[PDB]
């Protein structure tokens, strides 16, 4: 319960860019994908 992966807002973002969590960075708390991670991919893409 205290170990999520994708965030509500981010899910919308990834949905916008049409990307895959497994295809983008992720360093939250317990294996996840953060908006900052999406940024890294966005900048490195």
From Swiss-Prot:
Modified-residue entries (N6-acetyllysine), positions: 40
Subunit and partners: Forms a 24-polypeptide structural core with octahedral symmetry. Part of the 2-oxoglutarate dehydrogenase (OGDH) complex composed of E1 (2-oxoglutarate dehydrogenase), E2 (dihydrolipoamide succinyltransferase) and E3 (dihydrolipoamide dehydrogenase); the complex contains multiple copies of the three enzymatic components (E1, E2 and E3). Interacts with SucA (via N-terminus), the E1 component of OGDH complex.
Similarity comment text for this entry: Belongs to the 2-oxoacid dehydrogenase family.
Name the record gives this protein: Dihydrolipoyllysine-residue succinyltransferase component of 2-oxoglutarate dehydrogenase complex
Parent-protein residues present: 109 to 153 of 405
Organism: Escherichia coli O157:H7
Role of this protein: E2 component of the 2-oxoglutarate dehydrogenase (OGDH) complex which catalyzes the second step in the conversion of 2-oxoglutarate to succinyl-CoA and CO(2).
Gene: sucB
All residue ranges annotated as the Peripheral subunit-binding (PSBD) domain in the record: 5-42
